[PDB]
Amino acid sequence: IKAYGWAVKDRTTGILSPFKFSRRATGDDDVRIKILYCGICHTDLASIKNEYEFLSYPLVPGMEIVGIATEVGKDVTKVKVGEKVALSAYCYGGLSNETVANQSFVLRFPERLSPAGGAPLLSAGITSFSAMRNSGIDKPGLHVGVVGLGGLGHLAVKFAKAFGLKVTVISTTPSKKDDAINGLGADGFLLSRDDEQMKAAIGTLDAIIDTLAVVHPIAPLLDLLRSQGKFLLLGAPSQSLELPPIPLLSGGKSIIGSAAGNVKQTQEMLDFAAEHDITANVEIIPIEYINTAMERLDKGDVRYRFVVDIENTLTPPS
Amino acid sequence: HPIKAYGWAVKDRTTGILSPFKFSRRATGDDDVRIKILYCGICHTDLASIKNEYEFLSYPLVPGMEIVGIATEVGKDVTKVKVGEKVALSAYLCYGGLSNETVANQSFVLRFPERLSPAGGAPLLSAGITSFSAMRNSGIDKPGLHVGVVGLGGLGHLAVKFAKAFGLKVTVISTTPSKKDDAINGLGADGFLLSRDDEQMKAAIGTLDAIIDTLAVVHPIAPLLDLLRSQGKFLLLGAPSQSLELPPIPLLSGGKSIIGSAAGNVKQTQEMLDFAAEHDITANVEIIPIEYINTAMERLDKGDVRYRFVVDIENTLTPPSE
């Protein structure tokens, strides 16, 4: 029933510190999950940045949880104790020694994937996978643009390439050209701040995958879309964006929200990622580094994912 | 003192059939590391030994050289490795990896990177290091160079991944048209050349800075040499059983060279492993149970795997009846 982790005790500071708490006992349909790794996504950074008003005073962040089933209720049939499992994010998150969830919320973590590199698949991976699949951008030949080479974006590139798409990375960090092209497999690299290159790419893209969490302008991006092209909104900005009616109507173009859910689809994504050997490029960090990573994350100073090592790094205060 | 062990061995070199086998290993010396084997990759050298192509091999033969495991005992003088650490074995240095455990001098034992899958990471220890070291030793690691990879198998598909992470432009030369999508979209190759397309072959003459030949069967190298620019390098990485036909004219007139692999240097192997960790490079593997090993061998002889068999020894190896 007892548990421990790292928590933000003061919403104004956002600083994480050790916290002990207690968890519900394993019910008849629940699954015991020993947490080995938890990925750090933007939602965690935002919650630490005091951007979610509905937050509870002690905040344990982390949504990309890969773990080991170590106990199951009597009615749990799919999951077995000892199995490497991961939790789709549908009270206390993943920066803890263990968690408990209804068996329906647990997915089997594929044999062939690293649990550390595979953990950001459970939020970033399914988001990219679901958006591309639901919107029918999975077809070999399509030219797609990925806006923002962050955590979500760099995974979007890998899924897009494994779908057989041509991928252009649209970013504001010129130093990332080699990572995008050689490290992630992108076919092209477009500098957002180069209107000359930008104007050359007008009407070239079948679809755009927007992973940014800042407001930014979408009108210059929409102009990169061919007629009837699709603009996939995957990032969740705190503010809202300014839809320019003129560029959208003229062009038959559409903006589609990311229904990145459907835990059954999440399992399909995991099996897809297993077949194509897709994981995130990860930086495994100790929990005592979490606050430094938070400031590195806010400044984009990471190579596309922080993953906290619950395995060897959470030490038990009590 | 000596520790009993079990695995699968070829008891009759003439048939090449593997079956359960009991044996014994030396006790842990002061510099040794006992390793519980989790995964063993299957390489071509394993297939060749099973096909009885090495006359100097002693039998019963337990094959397998791409070993990832957990250290379970260390000698008193061993400080680098600690019990419980995920480790990997150098292929350089009687009974191989298709067994429940092995023991090795600490100098041959490598730290297995946190970020790599132990199953997908196991072929790095023979196929990975071969590609990595050959590219590094011969100076084909420079962003911009155009390299061709001959043969999209276990070695070849890893060569492409390392080449792309080095920043090279990579053309895959194959005789399997169905492999075009994996090569270009799945592995990141910039082009796919059909060896048997005289139009494509003649169009690529003199375009390649280097060639990485991974094939293990006998084949002609003259048309491949012709794809090389002047002073180009032909890296021979596969080990055919028969000998190859060196055409003197294409080589001499081109100033071209054929370079052997020498994929060793455990220090280089750790460099490769850390490199593979930073760039998230693993093999595309098919995890199989040990009792499937004979069927996997015959699939392997025909190249019917995408792209590496890895035996789940941890969960699948049981002792002979006992």
Author numbering:
A (entry chain A): 12 to 101, 136 to 363
B (entry chain B): 10 to 102, 136 to 364
In the authors' words:
For example, we recently reported the discovery of dihydroprecondylocarpine acetate synthase (DPAS), an ADH involved in vinblastine biosynthesis in the plant Catharanthus roseus and in ibogaine biosynthesis in the phylogenetically related species Tabernanthe iboga. The recently discovered DPAS reduces the substrate precondylocarpine acetate to yield an initial, unstable product, which is hypothesised to be dihydroprecondylocarpine acetate. The site of incorporation indicates DPAS catalyses the 1,4‐reduction of the α,β‐unsaturated iminium moiety and is thereby the first reported ADH with 1,4‐reduction activity. We report four crystal structures of apo‐ and substrate‐bound DPAS from two phylogenetically related species. These structures reveal, surprisingly, the loss of the catalytic zinc ion from the DPAS active site, indicating that zinc is not strictly required for reduction by ADHs. The lack of the catalytic zinc in DPAS is substantiated by the observation that two of the conserved catalytic zinc coordinating residues are mutated (His74Met and Cys168Ser). To investigate the catalytic mechanism of CrDPAS, we performed site directed mutagenesis of key residues involved in coordination of the catalytic zinc and the proton relay. A DPAS mutant in which the zinc ion coordinating residues were restored (Met74His, Ser168Cys) still reduced precondylocarpine acetate. Collectively, these findings suggest the 1,4‐α,β‐unsaturated iminium reduction catalysed by CrDPAS does not require a catalytic zinc or a proton relay, but reintroduction of these features did not abolish activity.
pmcAlcohol dehydrogenases (ADHs EC 1.1.1.1) are NAD(P)H‐dependent medium‐chain oxidoreductases found in all kingdoms of life. The structural motifs of ADHs are highly conserved in all known eukaryotic examples; most notably, a zinc ion involved in catalysis, a second zinc ion involved in maintaining protein structure, and the Rossmann peptide‐fold involved in cofactor binding. ADHs have been shown to catalyse many complex biochemical transformations in plant natural product biosynthesis, suggesting that their catalytic repertoire has been expanded.
